[PDB]
Amino acid sequence: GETTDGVYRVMTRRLLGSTQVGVGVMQEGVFHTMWHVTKGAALRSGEGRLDPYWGDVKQDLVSYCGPWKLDAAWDGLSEVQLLAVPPGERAKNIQTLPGIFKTKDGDIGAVALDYPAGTSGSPILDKCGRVIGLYGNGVVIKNGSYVSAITQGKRE
Amino acid sequence: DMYIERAGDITWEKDAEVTGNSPRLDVALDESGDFSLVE
Numbered sequence: 001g002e003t004t005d006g007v008y009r010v011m012t013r014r015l016l017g018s019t020q021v022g023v024g025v026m027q028e029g030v031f032h033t034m035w036h037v038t039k040g041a042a043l044r045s046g047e048g049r050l051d052p053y054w055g056d057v058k059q060d061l062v063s064y065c066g067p068w069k070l071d072a073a074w075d076g077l078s079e080v081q082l083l084a085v086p087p088g089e090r091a092k093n094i095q096t097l098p099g100i101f102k103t104k105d106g107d108i109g110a111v112a113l114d115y116p117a118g119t120s121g122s123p124i125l126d127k128c129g130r131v132i133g134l135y136g137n138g139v140v141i142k143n144g145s146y147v148s149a150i151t152q153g154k155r156e
Numbered sequence: 157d158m159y160i161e162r163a164g165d166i167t168w169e170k171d172a173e174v175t176g177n178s179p180r181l182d183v184a185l186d187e188s189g190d191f192s193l194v195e
């Protein structure tokens with residue numbers, strides 16, 4: 001169906017009406033989303049079918065039609081933009097300075113923006129428009145708000 | 157059956173809404189891909 005690069009909504013008809021379960025990035029013929037959005041299931045793009053190619057539950061990432069293509073990284077200094085695609089709402093660029101998730105295996109950038117769960121898979125981008133990660137896997141802090149990691153895969 | 161629909165271009169937009177703070181949190185990542193807070 002549509003293989004043009006960009007941001008896409010991930011919809012399902014299995015629940016009430018047409019529900020947006022997530023978001024993804026089409027780059028170089030490959031669709032990139034978070035694992036929890038599709039659970040590894042096949043996707044439809046008009047009349048064409050997209051089959052999973054790579055996936056990892058711990059990274060919470062999945063790629064379709066080919067290997068993971070997104071390899072830019074947050075520079076640990078500069079502001080970034082979450083290209084938020086909320087359910088039923090227009091794509092909107094939100095500029096922010098990322099915080100940090102400190103883990104036993106190293107530090108990871110994090111964006112403190114609260115959006116509906118169906119916004120999972122929305123890309124986080126740098127000043128060059130390159131996707132440095134996806135939004136949607138993180139934690140709930142003291143006041144109940146969501147803080148998401150900047151989740152990036154590996155380009156082989 | 158899940159289906160996709162285009163929502164826009166991936167480009168940096170000048171003069172976009174600037175919001176959100178930058179917290180430094182101690183977190184743990186489990187085998188099921190779930191992040192939890194460590195305090």
Ligand SMILES: NCc1cccc(NC(=O)c2cccn3cc(CN4CCCC4)nc23)c1
Pocket residue numbers: 036060114115116117118119120135136137138146188189190191
């Ligand atoms: N470990 C993978 C995994 C599995 C299942 C779900 C997720 N992600 C989320 O739930 C999520 C994503 C994006 C923004 N959010 C905002 C909130 C706040 N919640 C919404 C319902 C009540 C409060 N939750 C989210 C991640």
